[model samples]
Target chain A: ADKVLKEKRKLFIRSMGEGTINGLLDELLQTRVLNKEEMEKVKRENATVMDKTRALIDSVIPKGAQACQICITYICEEDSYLAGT
Target chain B: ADKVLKEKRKLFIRSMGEGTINGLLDELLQTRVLNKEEMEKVKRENATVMDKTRALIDSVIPKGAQACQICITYICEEDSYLAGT
Candidate 1:
């Protein structure tokens, strides 16, 4: 199960382009590698971390900076994802 | 310049897989939209944010949890990237 998780992460990072995070998480949930409740917990935990990081970046980088905006947008979309139960 | 920045961000998020962040940053540096020093500064700042987030997640999640491991690995590899000037 651990190997399975690592392989899926690699697939998302290396082969899959854009939105792969959501797809990968969904597949994991469907396969019962993680149950819906467990997946939701992970998503929420992940979002909290991301939100912290995003806020940190916002504080350090200029509001108009491209990198800052890009990071913010990524965090926003990720937070809004309604993972299927 | 702002339009170019946003367009590049979209291209990276929509099409590029995995290593797009480094690639996008390199392109910007080459085009002189941001200079080498600025790029390096951004990279360092980003890493600091990731590190803080990673540490936070590590404290909250079990060490053996797959989601925890995946997030840690992503941050590790991203921090190791050496962007060209």
Candidate 2:
């Protein structure tokens, strides 16, 4: 479910549409796919993954800077995710 | 930092400004401040801190609920930090 790029290591943020994340959540919660502990475990793993993502991004985008007006929502600041879906 | 209100554990989301997170990012990036290990430590700490925050909020906010109209921007879904600087 992912495409790998050797250089430039960027996630070209999903542009087709949004709400896919919500849909994924719906599927997970509706089907009882993950137990409460499992859900929390996923959350923890997600936290780590998110840290790595931000670290990589920060390494590129200068500190005290924005990721250009072209894609601010795509920016992975705080807890906002762009490529989860 | 321990302003405990037994009744509610709400984290009155900071609504003052948006650039503070960026400022904190700048400060960290500038000081040669964090070595890879240090950076990873803070990043890991941040991951847990953020998760606990979100879990607490989610317990009350409900699966399909959003915060009231007062401030939709403060929603902390993934890793978008609101308080750092």
Candidate 3:
């Protein structure tokens, strides 16, 4: 995921809707990557959907292997992780 | 203006509020830098105020010389062109 996401995170900011963003946060919590506190905190700070997506994506990718994988799988679930990327 | 604006453009995206953005567009039109139609079109397409600022700034700077000055004059009319930049 790092291999692709690092290169394309800028695209994500422009592309991700609020729906997919909240969806990714849910999966991230299930994966135990972000505590609910951090998740809610980030949500509170999101003045725009773009800000929400940027913060969430940046937080996960830097956590390394498993954390990165959770995001990749979620992004790929509907589409556009590797295929569109 | 060109000398400083070119360097601080990325900063402008973060700093300019909707007030300053609308303010800039009006000045651009008054100076004949952009037709009112183009100005309004850009305004309509702007889903985010950030998008609005980005398009308006990018449109002016490359027109060269005075086109850039109208923008610089507006931005500096109150504050934050060179002093804070």
Off by over 4 Å in 3: A1-85, B44-47, B80-85
Residue-wise lDDT of candidate 2 within A2-30, one digit each (tens)? 12221324544212222343343334455
* Local accuracy of candidate 2 as per-residue lDDT tens digits, B1-85: 2222212335443232223433433343454433333333433434334433343333233332332211222233313653432
List the DockQ of the predictions in order.
0.02, 0.08, 0.02
lDDT of 3: 0.64
Docking class of 2: incorrect
| Clash list (residue pairs), candidate 2 | A77-B80, A78-B79, A78-B80, A78-B81, A79-B78, A79-B79, A79-B80, A80-B79, A80-B80
Stretches of candidate 2 above 4 Å error? A1-27, A43-85, B1-25, B31-85
Q: Which is the winner by TM-score between candidate 2 and candidate 3?
A: 3
Second chain TM-score per prediction? 0.34, 0.25, 0.72
State each candidate's chain A TM-score: 0.34, 0.27, 0.74
Top lDDT hit:
3
Instruction: Tell me the tens digit of each residue's lDDT in model 3 across B45-68.
Output: 424455565676558555465667
Candidate 2: what lDDT? 0.34
lDDT of 1 by residue, B1-85 (tens): 2222233233222222325455545554564544577556653332223232223223323333443233334435545543210
Model 3, A56: alpha-carbon shift in Å?
8.2
